[PDB]
Amino acid sequence: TEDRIQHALERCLHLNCWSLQELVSRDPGHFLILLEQILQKTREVQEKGTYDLLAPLALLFYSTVLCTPHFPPDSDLLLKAARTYHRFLTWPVPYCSICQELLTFIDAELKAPGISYQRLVRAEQGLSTRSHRSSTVTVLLLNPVEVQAEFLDVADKLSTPGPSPHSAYITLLLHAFQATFGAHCDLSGLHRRLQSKTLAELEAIFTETAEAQELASGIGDAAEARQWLRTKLQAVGPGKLRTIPIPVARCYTYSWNQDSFDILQEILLKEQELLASTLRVVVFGSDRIGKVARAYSNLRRLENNRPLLTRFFKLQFFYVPVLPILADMLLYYCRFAARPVLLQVYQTELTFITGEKTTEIFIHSLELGHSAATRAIKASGPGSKRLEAVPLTLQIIYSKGAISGRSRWSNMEKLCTSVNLSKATEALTLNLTEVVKRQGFNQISTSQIKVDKVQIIGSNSCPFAVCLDQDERKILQSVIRCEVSPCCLPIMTFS
Template sequence: MQHTSCTEDRIHHALERCLHRLSQSSSADTWSAGLCMNRWSLEELVNRDPENFLILLQQILKKTREVQEQCEYILVAPLALMFFSTALQTPYFPPHCDLLREACEVYHSFLTWPEPYCSVCRDLLTFIHQELKAPGISYHRLVREEQGLATDNQQSKTITVLLMNPSDIPPEFLAVSEQLSNVRHSQKDAYIILIKHAYQSAFGARYPLDCMQKVLESKKVEELSSIFSDITDILETAVSVEDIDKAREHLLEDLERLREKIGLPAPNSKKSEGMLQTLSLPIARCHTYHWDKDNFDILNEIFQAECDLAEAQPQPDEGEDDEEEEEDVEEEEVAVNGCVDHRASTFSTVSILSTASKDSMLSNNSFSSISSSSSGPSRLSVASGMDSDFCEDTEEESSTDKTPKARARLGKRISMLFKSKSSNSLNRAKSLGNTEAKDYVTIRSKRSNSLPQQVHLQSPENMFLRNVCYRRRPILSCDEDTKTTTLRVVVFGADQITGKVARAYSNLRLQESRCPRLTRLFKLQFFFIPVKRNSSSPAVGVSSPGSLSDSPGRGSMAVDPSLPCLEDSTNDIAQYLGMLDPWYKRNMLSLLNLPVEVLCQQTSKTEPDVSSSTRERLPILADMVLYYCRHAARPVLVQLYQAELMLAGGMKRTEVFIHSLELGHTAGTRAVKASGPVCKRFGIDGDREAVPLTLEIVYNKVSVSGRNQWSKVNKICTSVNLTKACKKPEELDSKMECLQLTMTEVLKRQNSKSKKGYNQQLNTTQVKVDKVQVSGACNTTFAVCLDQDERKIFQSVTRCEISVCYKPESGMHWRIRKALSSQPLCPEFCSLLCLPISTFSGAHS
């Protein structure tokens, strides 16, 4: 039996607690309130002694071997991320320590595992190889970029922006964000800590840091800047050398020569004269903004403050050539968080829709025929999906369509859409690690015989097969390789705020297509931190609008247990990300289970200081936010949806949503609640007191089998709600990417001359769909609310059409490395447009 010290036992136990119940579902985890604190507690324990870092790395490697033997896929990414964050802050790796080389052997075996595990381990191996050549270079780069320290050869920078709505989040969160924003390290302090870290990483305790501190403090900022620039060049030169031993040798020699320039005394002997110190990462420079808009105009302040305005002058409009260039930019390779991810098209749980979903998504001609028979031409047509690209400015769309070039392009695309092709097989992506199938997925879609359309039902010979290749990409895809500044956008809130982010992201694409500003200089990364919506907001603290009362009296809110209750505010998107990435669930989603007082209390952890006069105490929440921003490098592409609204006056609007669409009484009740104290005058009724709406509903039902079934029904409903189906693990399957349609139908209504009408019998129907059209019959109008946002409620809507956000493409810019023998001829290409939200490991298969 191997004897261990008390410290090793404590670190081993803390590591086990970090991984405890990580692979279990949330329903089985009834004691999850403090699980998110385990990683933070482990870091607190390790930071007490520099030797603890090596102990933790040994424990992680030991656990990784066990995971490999037992094939516990779910633990691979957390262990790799923990190894990275620990090695990043390890003060010194002694020459006789083979931990990094041993880690190379361990994690190299995971390169044959499927995605995302192989990508996580590949990035970790890159980090290890760089650290073997130039110890401390990753720490140096991270701090240099976060503190905005540039040299002649290195201009990269990272800016962190915290966006929060004061009416939706607790005031303690605002206080923490303000504290993060107020921390500003001077250039001199940042230079000193990086110079000290470079020498400690290379020589250990050979040069005492206390002595170095005094020497560096006596120098001017210009001198420190020159020393910092030399150290940066030394590290970058060493990491570019192929041979590890030669790189390390040159690094030590160059740092020794630089020591004389700094003025550090030479050591009396080869023995260490000082002690190792733990130099934790300084607080990143953050900017906090109060944000409640559907746009990112507030980021222009960062643009003005941080960028050279001369480089950001918009290019003049050159007419038709610019239109072609705009399409080319939109059809580029998926580029998220600064890297091109060719595996995004085969994302295990969110990569493709089912065959049925794709069929309904592209069979817009059939859908428009249904709607045209009752309410005129529909914007949810082939043209709307291709040209508008979810543009809210209908005037601009109409003017664009009038041009002959746009008309010709539209006609060509429509003819391609209805062009008959042949296909005999359904190609699967097979293993996520398959290099032959990772760039595209070929799908055979067949029009269903059950389409509610008289023309196609009477003419079955017109049915055809279409071969369509799909991939997911963000709405805003552009070349990220030439950009040196990364802009982290961290958003706090519930599902309502993710809807604002989705619409702001969509609007940003429209702005950047006309006049590129932010995307020309910034690599955009989006981070989402779930927060329970503040009970003081207008839409919280009142009984749910979906609650149904047993009594016909006004304001009676007793809940009928037989009918579902719609929540005022949810965190379904965060739950969705948590099911895809368990490490996100453990570190971010679990924050919802902790009291605000615990998250925002001051801790004993102090900010590393270069001068003993200033010490910053970090709240736990601040530490969690910084950990998330620094280590969440893989985005999950969350599908966006579009709603085409026809208002009573004839005006059309196109809106984007990400989580939910509420129609009828549910949206009207939310509007009443948003009115604040005035809502007491109106009263808030349940569905039993609601005025029924006569609606014509057409929807495409999807199933796991891949079949689609169109249905056309006439119902008298109080409300019709659509929510992203993402609450159960089985709904994460690519074939089930859909919306949950909930219809509350009035089966029997009691009318009285002396009393208010009363819906005596209600029935709720739930169907999984991917395409819906709701029209008001007999001049019926209704209200529509997007993503539980009280500011996104539309009144007097006559027709609402919902579908997946997508964009047909030419396929010219799709990089298909090797054509499969079963690939169909002349396939059609289509991009499903998504919002990229950063997670730690992406989606688990």
């Protein structure tokens, strides 16, 4: 068994994770052995200095210590782990910043065992108390026409309400009590006696148990915290240890054929009836489904400027490139992934023909002119039913920047129909369709130059239609000057 665990460990740090998290759960005894091995490898890194292999171990510890059915009082594994990870404070950021937040979790788990798994479960179910109330909701925004039927099945399964508040409270009480009293408790008798009890008394018992766990975690001394928690649980009240897995969290599956994230506020109406907190939006993603970032754009600024969803919830978006193994792996990722990845947003200063000014953001691209006009008519419908490109005379100053701070300037006056900006600090691939000769066909000279910063000035009598990030429905014309330079709801990545 030990050598099996070691092989799996050495093959998962190369669906190799799910198999680890499915082999340990068999025996209550497999959760300590694995942890011991992890510490050994971790210590090697601490001795060596191989910077690249720390974060997967720091995630495996957190993941296993939170599923470990119980830690024997004799075993001093947490102290050895804390001593091993205390010496990473001398490492470069972010390693010290993953270790500080692991040490805090290892103090929460040293003082009040099972607190970090009862917090998670409580939250995810929405069965919190009247003292520390919270909630988490999962929305599966999936396109019926793009997602596979296998993913549609997994989604349907996940959505199905499996547990009830009664069963959830029974599981929470069983795991809070087991984590403390190990085998020395009777989980069969406790379950049988808890089954006959009513929902309200179960809620009161869990609220007292959670308050005791939190208070014990708040006690300075670790040694007395465990004894105080044990005494409190005894007042509230050898066998075989039992693995209590994570109950499935609340999930909702909605058919998203759209691209804008307006759907979410429609959902928020049944949120008025379904109630800081957090919302786990699991976006399922294809190649073109580009436009998802464009929708992110709105839900970033729009909300930042018209807070509607953020009023109660902290949004978090998860990208899926598109119970069964996919269900387990999905829930595990969503649960244990907690570090976002913010993508760069370019800033544009626009002076209108009227003279007003307002900074904006193009995440994906910036089109202008014949492309902008074409998109304008694509967004017309009846208009496009009732409704060549004369060039737009623009003086454009583009600056190539560098970390050295030496910007190399260049400029030219041109008479080009359109100009689109496209993405490679970052580089901005740019296209300039010149009208070498105006006429219903204008000579087209696609010029690809690598600009990072740009300055466009158009004649007040030559308004130019401007599209940001290919948003065909909101093109901006009547602009006379445009200055472009490279400038909660995060998207998330496991590493």
